[PDB]
Every structure is written in structure tokens, then in C-alpha cells.
């Protein structure tokens, strides 16, 4: 069918448009955005806390900072680094040495189907243990709050301040899991998948949204600091995007030909 594609709008035609044929039946609705993003996937593998940690200091962190890394899961499909929102995703090709290997995360299953710019949904976090018989718990603090980092001596036991709070501290059973659904808490109307504005928190980094997150979870162990174990235990954070809505179509990542 004779067209002009310089116009920018092409009417999607069928076989009957040029030839003799008919329309096929509608297959299914598995491309529905509220249906397609509504399934769980691995987000980040964070180490389980055992003491009242220091939250990671803001960038640029200098050496001699006695902070606690690899502990907080900033719940976001966008690339993160050191439990803080980043712009580039970077893994370690040859991690020999040298400093602190920063925990990065990315939602691999999201950006392959995030052909849009803005995305709003609830979040259903399931925190699966990666340790046999682990009796852990799961904190949370919203987009814009900060970690309460101290302890209080309860009967000569340094019970930390992340055992309590007005935010959900879900306690897992022995060998169980933690599953709860978090609302869209951030101050932005939508989470920018791609962002081009500047956040003026620092020397203004272009393309870094400051409040594109559902918060930040952290696993801990419900014992005081005297009962701190030795081997560092992990946990695995599965998230699901409940009630997904997506705006403003955009690009999919570049599949290299090599």
C-alpha cells in the first residue's frame, strides 16, 4: 500500500490491504503493561545485618570512612551503586584488589521491556533467604527517610534502633520468607526510567533522579550485638510491580551484533 513514512504515522495494515486475505484472531493480552510487569524477579542480593550499621556516606566517599556496605537494597529498577541511586550500571570485570567492591544492582528483566520513560507501580517485595535455617527480619524506610543508626542498652544487650520504628519491620519465621506490598511512596509522580534533568543535591549530576525509588530495605538478625555471628549471611530480594502504569514510549537497549 502506497504510503509516506516521512510523515511519521503509518497505519498498521493487514494482508487484505495489499493482497487477498483476512485478519487473524486476537492472540492474547500478555503485552498488557499491568499484566506483563506483574511478576517477581531477583533485584539485589544484600548481606544480612548483625549490628547497628552505619549507613553509606554520600558520594564521594573517601578512605578511612568506617561505614557498612553491601547491606541496603535501594528498591529500584534503575542502576544503583553502594545502596544509592546511580546513572551508570557497572559490574567488575577483574575485581582483584583494591578498595571496597561496591554493590551494584539492575533489574535485567525490566529494561529489556522498559520501552518507555515514566513508570509508576506498587512494589511487592519478597525477601528469600540464601542460607539454610536463617531466622532473619526485613526492615524498610521510605523514599526520603534515612536509616536510624544507633543502639540502646536493653538489659546489658546492645539492641539496635533498627528493631523498632513506624515503618514495617517484618520478622521472618525460621526458614521462612517475608512478603509485603509497598505503595508508591516517592515524592515524584512517576519513576523516570530515563531522566535528563539535573538533581541539585551535589555538583549537579545530569540524568540522576534523586527520588526514583520505593524505599530501601535491609535484612537483619533479631539478636542483640553480643550475639553477633561470624560468617556473613546473605538474603535475596524479589520484587513485583503491582498495578503497573507506563507513559511516554521510548527505546529498548542496544543488542550488539558480535
Amino acid at each position: 500500500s502506497t504510503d509516506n513514512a516521512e510523515t511519521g504515522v503509518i497505519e498498521a495494515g493487514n494482508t487484505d490491504t495489499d493482497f487477498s486475505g483476512e485478519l487473524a484472531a486476537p492472540g492474547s493480552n500478555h503485552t498488557n503493561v499491568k499484566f506483563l510487569f506483574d511478576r517477581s524477579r531477583l533485584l539485589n542480593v544484600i548481606k544480612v545485618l548483625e549490628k547497628d550499621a552505619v549507613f553509606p556516606r554520600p558520594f564521594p566517599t573517601q578512605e578511612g570512612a568506617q561505614q557498612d556496605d553491601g547491606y541496603f537494597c535501594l528498591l529500584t529498577p534503575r542502576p544503583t551503586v553502594a545502596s544509592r541511586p546511580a546513572t551508570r550500571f557497572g559490574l567488575y570485570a577483574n575485581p582483584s584488589g583494591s578498595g571496597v567492591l561496591a554493590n551494584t544492582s539492575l533489574d535485567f528483566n525490566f529494561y529489556s521491556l522498559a520501552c518507555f520513560t515514566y513508570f509508576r507501580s506498587d512494589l511487592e517485595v519478597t525477601v528469600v533467604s540464601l542460607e539454610p535455617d536463617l531466622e532473619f527480619a526485613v526492615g524498610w524506610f521510605p523514599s526520603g527517610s534515612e536509616y536510624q543508626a544507633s543502639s540502646f542498652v536493653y538489659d546489658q544487650l546492645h539492641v539496635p534502633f533498627h528493631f523498632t520504628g513506624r515503618t514495617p519491620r517484618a520478622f521472618a519465621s525460621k526458614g521462612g520468607k517475608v512478603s509485603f506490598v509497598l505503595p508508591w511512596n516517592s515524592v515524584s509522580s512517576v519513576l523516570p526510567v530515563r531522566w535528563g534533568g539535573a538533581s541539585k543535591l551535589s555538583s549537579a549530576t545530569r540524568g540522576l533522579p534523586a527520588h526514583a525509588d520505593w524505599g530501601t530495605i535491609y535484612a537483619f538478625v533479631p539478636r542483640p550485638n553480643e550475639k553477633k555471628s561470624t560468617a556473613v549471611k546473605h538474603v535475596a530480594v524479589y520484587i513485583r510491580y503491582k498495578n503497573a502504569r507506563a507513559w511516554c514510549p521510548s527505546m529498548l537497549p542496544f543488542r550488539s551484533y558480535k
Binding site: 564521594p60 577483574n94 582483584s96 584488589g97 578498595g99
Partner: protein, 185 residues
């Protein structure tokens, strides 16, 4: 020392960052003419590239079939990326540490092609990894391409006079490489 080195080794740790996209043939012709002028069997040379991934593009070898093919792979290099010179030195420090397992006394020389304009938080790591090659008995020369930073190379190199620009330090490295080949066995 007075004892001759059993093997004289050479490291072309080459910068292929996004900032040397306009000066890559100047870098390559500095390596095309220091690999052809030295075809001696006592010299082993390696071609290390770095922009973001520090990459051993050719291992430390002396068979001249490979060095002919090593330069014909540096010509197929497109620059682009950040400037991770701390990983340019980790690909050599994994090869000085291997050649110390042979048990010889080897004078491994590091030639560091660079643009000099390093980030402030990467110069801490590039100096820290250079000092781990100066713990392993290597000598680091920073071949400066057009405009660079001397003070950002006075700590990568051994002193402020080991830094050479590329138009002056072509023959000046021939006065150092061939100086030690007579000092070798």
C-alpha cells in the same frame, strides 16, 4: 646491578579512552616503531590497552609472529570510554608477578601511554596501582601525548624526569631500552 638481566621485558600500557579518540594514530605509531626497531630475541613485549576494562591485548611474548599480529590488532582498535589506568597496571602486575615465578632477575619496563588528564578519584587508584608495580621492581615511563598533566604523571612515573612527551621521548626511550639491552645478557 652488575649482573645482567636474564630477560628484558616491556609493557606498552596503552590508553584507548574517549579522550584519545583524536590521538590514537599518534599512540599507535609510537608502538609501531618501537616494536619494529627492536626485533631482538632478548626483548619480550606486551600490548595492554585500557579505557574501562584493562585488557591484555597481547601477552608478554617474544615470538615475532605474534608481535606482527599484535600491532595488526592495535590498528583495529576504536577508542572510547573512561580512563581506568589503575586497571592498565593490574594487567601488567599480573605479569610481573608471573615472571617472578620463573626465578630470574628481569628488568620489566612499563611504558604508559596516557593523556594525563585523570580524574581526581582515579588518580588515587592509578598511583596506588603504579606503586604496586614499583614494589615489583618495574620502571614506569609516562609517554605524554599532546596536552597532558605533568603533576598527574610525576606520581605515576618514578620522578618528574621519567615523564617524556611523545615527540621527545621516542628516541629518549631508545636511549633507555637499548641502554639496558647491552646491560642484559
Amino acid at each position: 646491578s652488575m649482573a645482567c638481566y636474564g630477560g628484558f621485558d616491556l609493557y606498552f600500557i596503552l590508553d584507548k579512552s574517549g579522550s584519545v579518540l583524536h590521538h590514537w594514530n599518534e599512540i599507535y605509531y609510537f608502538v609501531e616503531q618501537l616494536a619494529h626497531k627492536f626485533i631482538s630475541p632478548q626483548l619480550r613485549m606486551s600490548f595492554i590497552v585500557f579505557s574501562t576494562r584493562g585488557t591484555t591485548l597481547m601477552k608478554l611474548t617474544e615470538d615475532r609472529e605474534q608481535i606482527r599480529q599484535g600491532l595488526e590488532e592495535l590498528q583495529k582498535v576504536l577508542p572510547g570510554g573512561d580512563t581506568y589506568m589503575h586497571e592498565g597496571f593490574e594487567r601488567a602486575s599480573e605479569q610481573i608477578y608471573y615472571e617472578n615465578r620463573q626465578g630470574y632477575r628481569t628488568a620489566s619496563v612499563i611504558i604508559a601511554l596516557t593523556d594525563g588528564e585523570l580524574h581526581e578519584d582515579l588518580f588515587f587508584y592509578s598511583e596506588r596501582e603504579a606503586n604496586r608495580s614499583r614494589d615489583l621492581g618495574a620502571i614506569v615511563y609516562a609517554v605524554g601525548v599532546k596536552d597532558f598533566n605533568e603533576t598527574q604523571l610525576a606520581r605515576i612515573a618514578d620522578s618528574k624526569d621519567h615523564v617524556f612527551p611523545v615527540n621527545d621521548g621516542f628516541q629518549a626511550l631508545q636511549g633507555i631500552i637499548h641502554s639496558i639491552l647491552k646491560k642484559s645478557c
